[PDB]
């Protein structure tokens, strides 16, 4: 057996590839072999399925190229890095209207992503809500949280960390957690609420206020103390730009941290997410492990330990080089090219949206499922899968809860996915009516559920 | 007449324009845009304030430069690593990777093809799911047996800080042997001292962070045998193999700590230190399927099926997971072994050099059979050669190294050591420059006596 | 013994260091060894000894990448290189007010560095003077060059030139060369006086003006011709742009040739020099080797031949894209940042200044000393010690003359060292400072000059 | 004016080439406009007349880039790079034979070319030459040094440190210098004798064994000792790999310092010359500066002072990669060429060879003149031009002396230059003289001497 590339005999990955490799290889053999199978990965230019950045600017390049070596936790050996995260903690604790800090540095801290932002912003939720029930000398024997559609990493935090997770069932007429549901849920073991600003699965915000407003006058008629974390993975680089008048950060009382991914909206590399507190108070200090450097020690609160700054260094760069000026323009045009969908598909079919990609709503998204007794002669599965196979990715899947038997399609529209490609996804959009049109048959044979989760 | 205090003021000798301070807007969100390359140029220059850590001789962490691992990294920054269905490449490739190191370690056949394992972002969060896994096997034996399940523990000795954060996240009550003059390590009687029924399993460190000196999990094993023996309390073990998991398997083979011994249900390991790949790769494996409770276990909907993962972090990259592929191929265990052998080589001269130029006590020598490739020494008791091990670390540093110099924990507090980690880029040339630099602050604080004393600052020991 | 970075046999650059390789080796192997050793070098970013270029243009490594096998004196098959540095001598001339040329190009040349445009400068005034003396039948064999805290270069033409070096001596409260002193050591055997326009050690600029009004009222006085050579090293591509009216250069009747270095405030790379003559009376013939090319002959006055065009180029670069316009905001940026370091570092301790970044007085450089009889508790050499310690390299060195017992320590501000930048040397030097203050047994153990000469 | 470049109005280069420019101007259109015009320069790939290296090697351009900012003379800056330039002082002194240091290091350093080189030794040679005539209480007024037909650097060496040139005449059946005519020119204030390892005009070896024996015979006869500088810019690196019996270095006693060109055969690219002593003795220390440094002090024999260092890093990987064994490939390679084209050149017309590429006889070089009394329709020069139409630079010109009749060819063979290329030379030279014979009217036209000094 020999290889058409290398012209020799055959390296096979796919063999002995259940065991440790034995011999040596030629280093750019192993590269150009591994460099060809990468190329069975898709590039996500059509995946329309993704909140995670997918568009490629040099500058970054170039930045996690130099950063490929630097330990984000060896604050000793890369100063300069740990001053830049520094400045990036402050400027997003800025960006959510978090209170002037004592010392001069907000209470806050890089992570990997939304994932670990979220497990801290748990535990500190937990501890806090232990601290309090010791003190009332109650048992801290059966905490649970309230919360409605959260992303899977909450149901992660709840299993891992032994919260009962009372989540707010979607539901026909009310897909989000309300007020009066939330408040039906909450009681002396609540260690605190989790509004999702901007709901993974069809795009919208849960706005914070009016669960705020609910919450101030349960603990008017209870005595009940309750606090929130806002998930505001994909929201919080979005509202403070396109829609300043929501009232949903540090500006409500009661929330006493915020969470969000800076590898979504935030425009940053894969790899970057953020969680800030509202003050030291909000942070309780068992958490915090000091560790020695030269320069004195520093209070860290992390799952993770040593991993690169590359990430943190491009998120740098977009705040820098964007400013609120820049991320207003390049997220108001991903909102044009939402909206521009929605109103284009609404003319196509008996549908019925539950998302438009409207600022004030929500993220720029577009959710919508079939009308309720209304058959165009085929299904959004069936949509889905015609789109497929012109390159793209449109993700068709069911809502949980009172909703199980809710069929929606969600398209969303991040930085790179312009007005030109939009225009060319209607095309094809039209082009797979047709084809269903045509071929009656295909109705109903599609039932699988594409990746949702991100 | 413009008042100093109102202006964006400052001209820039780089762009022959004006303003742009990093520092001074630094506590708020940036107002305006700004030119993409000045931004680059802005924060490119500032970066150059970093070390390069060639010559940091404290961190585990690979810091040589590969340009096939650049590119691969470069082609690898917008692949999701739980993005199974964009990217099935980089999900094969991952699986693949499993497979290796779980055959690496010794790992039972799997019944179905696939070991047992994931990979992670680091061996802390290796950790925390090896350490969860073992708590919910803990809990269940506990609950089928109708036994409480409020008081768990864990066993261990001088572990790295991501088990007190373990310990702490998860409520585990941490029974951490005291490191002591004459017994800096977890031995096997004070091991079963401190065992009992809510003991959810022992932690051996397969390479020390603080010393390089490898607990053996043998001896550990056999004790925990006879004691199930005399009380029937039935405890397992998670291997913390961070560094010696990419070592031993190559130098010294018939050291068994792995799979071999029965009781150890999980190990976990770091690809970014002596696994050779970039920062950001870690790895954790189980037995098998009975090894790793599957209500930790989370399936999610893929157009191709379901995939269960296991894992604190979700998306992220997936470049050095293929880069750690790329090393695997390039190397095998061919490749490995000559490339782990000679940082032993490097660490052995070292001890053996430095050896003859003071009163010291070594405690880790970089011997395979003992540990992994540092050098770990401490001035010899009632010894006062006219510095302390923190002075020498001062002068050192103003030659351009980084020696970390501080003092070990428990009872043994008032213990300094200095500790000087070899590994891969820092070869035997390096070495012997290190060397001159050593005899040369050595006469330097010889003479200026003044010098003894005055450094008292310990440096960053944890990687 | 195996290396672990190609997993192979160990080779060694140290073992047979004294002697010739014997064997081949692989190109790259050689490459990538010698790469990684080239990291214990340092990157001068934090070096503020130095007047050198050593920030980084992505043009200009491309240029210099393109001009790696340029010959600078093959004007034959490099007719362009050629061409661009006959423009950068008439651009030089043009900027130090050198008379219109007669036949349209100006009489000059680029060199190395200042040091050979010293020296060919040196020689030409050796051979005007030899000129003179010979047609009066007079001894030559005794010339003497008059100056003040001169860089080293001038202490070898001395040397290698046979010229005795009368050098007026740095004294407390007079560290320059005055008219009064200057005039005390000239006389018929001084083939000329060497002003420095921007002293090494300090910074400040020795004034020709009040120099050359002394040396008319000497040949007035004794009827003795004395001329001028203005070493401008660093001044040279400073004052024409943000003090034009100080007159220093060709303007005077005396000057008759200036230097200065394209390498340093020139903003050209490593390697490049230039000499400029008032006229071609100012440059003996005699010096000029004319060599033959294939378009005819064309003359040559350097001590180097063979070598790159690299450096012309890249300098041309600079011209072009900044013109006097640009440099005056380049130079203009250094000195605000020399100004402030200046009035900043003036309020942390009882310092004396010698320099303090005026663009009226000098070079942008701040060069101070403890105020005599002041006892801080430490010494400039152990503060800069301290700032080492935290990367920084600020030398701290004694002057010469009768000042020998001072010490003073000088920081360079030039491309590069942004105002940032020099906030954070602050920051370093703050904590220097507190660092000993709490530890007083530092104080008179460090005792070694630092590199000062350029 | 427009530009159809940039669409844009123009921009000139030509305009006030005069002047320095008065405004900025974008930085990558200066670059393509420098660019552009660099494309005006040849590159040497078909010019035969130059020593200098014009082959490109990736490796090479890489370190080059790298070093941009190392500079050469700041030894505590970069330690590394200096400690590299040690090692190559002590390879090259191994090279040629020089006693084994004393201490640990030979007594040399490197220099940007042959010519800085040659000026270090010429100095050497007089200030050795003056301590000795004074310790014997003789005048020292009127040196002079012995040489046969050397480059244009020694004739810069003689006219600007006042030393008689006293150069042996090329004549017809004598182009070199040899022991007798060398003897009639030596006396009491000979400084010293210069042969040429590598006659820049023709190629041939001046042998210093022979020489030498003359001034043992001398020194017998009349106690006068006069010592030898060796001036082997191209020699220096081919005898030694080529023919080691050759017997005119170091083992030569009389042979007091040796200079060659990295830049030429030493395979370095441009910008790098070596100048090695015997011992300590050989040279005065008066003429060597010491600098202090934080490392302690270090000195230098150099007129040049702050430079690049990438030349020295790049020559140092030729001689890690190649060894005596790769050198020894290399040169030989490039006497193959010479020979051949030598054997093959004299089957084409009544031509009487001076060099023909011989290891034995000199450098990889061919120089032919037309037999006397012998017209085959054509001068040298006349073929040199219709070559030039071909793309190649072989030059023609006169020899000097009495030779200044003798039209010479010369062919320089250097890395890069394979036999390939020569087959093609070959061809063209070939209908070069078929277009000659069918044009008999060109014959006597050219009569322009082209670049011969490197
Ligand atoms: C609301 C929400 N929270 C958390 C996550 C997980 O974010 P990450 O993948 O960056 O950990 C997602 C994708 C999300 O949409
Ligand atoms: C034994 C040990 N465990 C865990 C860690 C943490 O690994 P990481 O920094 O890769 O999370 C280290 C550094 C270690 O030495
Ligand atoms: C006044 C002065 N003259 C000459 C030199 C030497 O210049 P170069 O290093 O470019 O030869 C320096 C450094 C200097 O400061
Ligand atoms: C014999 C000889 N000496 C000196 C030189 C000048 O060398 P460089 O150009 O490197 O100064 C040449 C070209 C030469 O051929």
Same mark, same amino acid.
């Given at each position: ?27 750019? !053999? ?12 898709? @590039? ?10 997918? $568009? ?7 930045? *996690? ?6 330990? $984000? ?15 990036? !903690?402050? *400027?997003?604790?800025? =960006? ?6 004592? @010392? ?9 992503? #939304? ?45 891992? %960390? ?75 680089? =979005? ?34 997410? $953020?969680?800030? %507190? ?8 068992? =958490? ?15 799952? @993770? ?22 991320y207003t323009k390049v997220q108001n045009a991903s909102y ?7 109103? &284009? ?6 549908? &019925? ?7 004030? &709503? ?74 269903? #049109? ?17």
């Open positions: 057996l020999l290889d058409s590339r290398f012209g020799a005999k055959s390296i096979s990955t796919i063999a002995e590839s259940k065991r440790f490799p034995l011999h040596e290889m030629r280093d750019d !053999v192993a590269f150009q072999i591994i460099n060809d199978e990468l190329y069975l990965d898709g @590039n996500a230019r059509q995946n329309l399925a993704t909140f995670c950045q997918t $568009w490629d600017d040099e500058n970054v390049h170039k930045l *996690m190229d130099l950063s490929i070596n630097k330990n $984000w936790i060896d604050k000793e050996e890369y100063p300069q890095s740990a001053a830049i995260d520094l400045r990036c !903690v402050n *400027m997003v604790a800025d =960006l959510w209207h978090a209170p002037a800090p004592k @010392n001069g540095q907000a209470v806050g801290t890089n992570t990997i992503g #939304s994932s670990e932002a979220c497990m801290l912003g748990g535990m500190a939720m937990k501890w806090r809500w232990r601290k309090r029930m010791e003190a009332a000398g109650k048992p801290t024997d059966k905490p649970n949280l309230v919360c409605g559609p959260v992303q899977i990493c909450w149901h992660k935090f709840a299993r891992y %960390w032994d919260v009962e997770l009372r989540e707010i069932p979607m539901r026909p007429g009310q897909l989000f957690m309300d007020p009066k549901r939330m408040i039906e849920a909450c009681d002396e073991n609540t260690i605190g609420v989790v509004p999702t600003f901007g709901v993974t699965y069809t795009g919208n915000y849960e706005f914070p206020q009016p669960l705020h407003d609910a919450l101030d006058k349960f603990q008017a008629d209870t005595g009940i103390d309750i606090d929130m974390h806002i998930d505001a993975a994909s929201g919080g680089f =979005l509202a403070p730009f396109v829609a300043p008048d929501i009232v949903w950060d540090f500006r409500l009382p009661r929330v006493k941290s915020i969470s969000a991914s800076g590898h979504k909206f935030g425009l940053a590399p894969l790899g970057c997410g $953020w969680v800030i %507190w509202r003050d030291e108070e909000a942070l309780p200090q068992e =958490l915090v492990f000091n560790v020695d450097y030269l320069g004195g020690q520093i209070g860290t609160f992390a799952i @993770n330990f040593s991993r690169p700054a590359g990430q943190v260094i491009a998120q740098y760069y977009e705040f820098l080089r964007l400013g609120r000026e820049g044009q090219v939402a909206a521009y969908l929605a109103d &284009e598909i609404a003319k196509l079919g008996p549908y &019925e949206f539950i998302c438009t990609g409207r600022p004030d &709503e929500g993220i720029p998204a577009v959710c919508f499922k079939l009308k309720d007794g209304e058959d165009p002669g085929y299904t959004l599965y069936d949509l889905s899968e015609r789109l497929r196979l012109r390159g793209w990715q449109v993700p068709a899947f069911t809502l949980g809860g009172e909703a199980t038997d809710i069929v929606v399609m969600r398209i969303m529209c991040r930085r790179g996915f312009e007005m030109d490609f939009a225009e060319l996804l209607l095309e094809d959009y039209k082009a797979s009516l047709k084809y269903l #049109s045509d071929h009656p048959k295909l109705q109903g044979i599609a039932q699988q559920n594409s990746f949702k989760h991100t």
